[PDB]
Amino acid sequence: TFRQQTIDFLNDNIRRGIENYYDDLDFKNIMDFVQKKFKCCGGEDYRDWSKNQYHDCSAPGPLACGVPYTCCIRDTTEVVNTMCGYKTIDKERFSVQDVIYVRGCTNAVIIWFMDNLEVLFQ
């Protein structure tokens, strides 16, 4: 299939990146970088954040069932704070799409690579 095998490659790494997100600032930086730059959240989609222990919807803290602020939309006139991705993982896309990115980063990075393929070399 290759294509599916490739998609699964990227999702598997950022599933790992999501679990190690607070554990290793290198996964954290990359993940916060990809999500801000490519406007995207999670690997398949924002609900992948359920896989980090603090973000599982049955966790105790305030991050439970929510998504990190590097997933939030910043192209608005309104002041965005660090709580902007709270309580989104179980809602329907259309209810959160005004607040956070919902498309996954795996696919977002691929089309970007394909659109800039010629540019990448020289």
Swiss-Prot record:
Annotated glycosylation sites: 4, 75, 116
PTM characteristics: Palmitoylated.
Localization annotation: Cell membrane; Late endosome membrane
Superkingdom assignment: Eukaryota
Extracellular side: 1-116
SS bonds (residue pairs): 40-105, 41-71, 57-65, 72-84
Function according to Swiss-Prot or TrEMBL: Part of TspanC8 subgroup, composed of 6 members that interact with the transmembrane metalloprotease ADAM10. This interaction is required for ADAM10 exit from the endoplasmic reticulum and for enzymatic maturation and trafficking to the cell surface as well as substrate specificity. Different TspanC8/ADAM10 complexes have distinct substrates. Promotes ADAM10-mediated cleavage of CDH2. Negatively regulates ligand-induced Notch activity probably by regulating ADAM10 activity.
Subunit structure: Interacts with ADAM10; the interaction influences ADAM10 substrate specificity, endocytosis and turnover.
Family under the similarity heading: Belongs to the tetraspanin (TM4SF) family.
Protein name as annotated: Tetraspanin-15
Naturally occurring in which organism (per UniProt): Homo sapiens
UniProt gene name: TSPAN15
